[PDB]
């Protein structure tokens, strides 16, 4: 019974995050969006945050220890367990992390400040999220299709 | 619209962009929405200039909230492309934020410029 209650709670949470901010939900998903709303406190308090802050939401301990010890700061926070950065690996994962943080900041500002005439579909409300998602996936597939270094093909002799 | 402290006078826009170019040469400037946000939150920003030709205005409408909370003047110039090649970027910047220091002719210019922004208000 507890597990079935958890499952229907997650369905409710997805419905509610879709109702609140469709741009962030079309970008990453209601779960990680809910995590970001939790760590910020409020939707307006999150919309007041810049892109780098949304990148390193959740990694605050490692961030401030590395900054106070002159170490290298952590690359990402909850954006890792977001979906779209999961397709990459290593440096492309870091670059997708920056780009997804910036577009998430854009989409959360749009979802928390744009006004609509209320006879507006969820599609024309989440147009910014859909466009950002498509463009970001194109950038990801490009970084994945970056070619390796060409090398001199040596024959049997060494020529 | 929501761009109520708008700067429409072309002499005022020319003065603002000349001041932005000068501060950019002095590296007393922060370019872009996210660096504007960070500078205003840390409270160092002496004046902040937004661009009205952003196609979703909501991607910059958050800055006046913290600006009212921190009592720093903000003003809307028309063209993001004008603001861009005034900063010296060749990309369309939408929110620039120019700070203050201990002593400079640019500090005196910033005082006069925020006086003119208060006139605009």
């Amino acid at each position: 019974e507890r597990s079935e209650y958890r499952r229907q709670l997650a369905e409710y949470l997805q419905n509610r995050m879709k109702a609140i901010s469709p741009n962030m939900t079309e970008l990453i998903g209601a779960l990680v969006g809910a995590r970001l709303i939790a760590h910020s406190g409020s939707l307006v308090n999150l919309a007041k945050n810049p892109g780098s802050t949304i990148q390193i939401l959740g990694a605050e301990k490692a961030l401030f220890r590395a900054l106070k010890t002159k170490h290298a700061t952590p690359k990402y926070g909850i954006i890792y367990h977001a979906s779209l950065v999961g397709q990459a690996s290593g440096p492309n994962k870091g670059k997708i992390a920056r780009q997804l943080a910036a577009k998430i900041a854009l989409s959360v500002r749009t979802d928390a400040f744009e006004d609509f005439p209320e006879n507006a579909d969820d599609e024309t409300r989440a147009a910014v999220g859909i466009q950002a998602r498509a463009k970001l996936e194109n950038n990801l597939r490009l970084l994945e299709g970056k070619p390796l270094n060409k090398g001199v093909a040596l024959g049997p002799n060494g020529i | 619209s929501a761009a109520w402290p708008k700067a429409e006078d072309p002499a005022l826009v020319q003065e603002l962009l000349d001041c932005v170019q000068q501060a950019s040469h002095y590296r007393q400037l922060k370019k872009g929405a996210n660096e504007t946000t960070k500078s205003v939150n840390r409270g160092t920003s002496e004046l902040v200039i937004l661009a009205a030709d952003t196609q979703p205005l909501s991607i910059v409408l958050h800055i006046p909230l913290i600006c009212e909370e921190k009592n720093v003047p903000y003003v809307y110039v028309p063209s993001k492309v004008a603001l861009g090649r005034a900063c010296g970027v060749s990309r369309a910047v939408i929110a620039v934020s120019l700070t203050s220091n201990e002593a400079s002719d640019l500090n005196s210019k910033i005082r006069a410029l925020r006086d003119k922004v208060e006139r605009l208000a």
């Binding site: 401030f64 900054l67 106070k68 002159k70 700061t73 | 840390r42 409270g43």
Partner: peptide
């Protein structure tokens, strides 16, 4: 730069708190 920025943020919060407490301790009215 990052380390100096963090120390400046801390010092700014402390200066705000101290100026507030100092004012709270200690032709104006007509």
């Amino acid at each position: 730069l990052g380390y100096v920025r963090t120390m400046r943020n801390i010092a700014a919060k402390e200066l705000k708190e101290l100026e507030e407490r100092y004012v709270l301790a200690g032709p104006k009215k007509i």
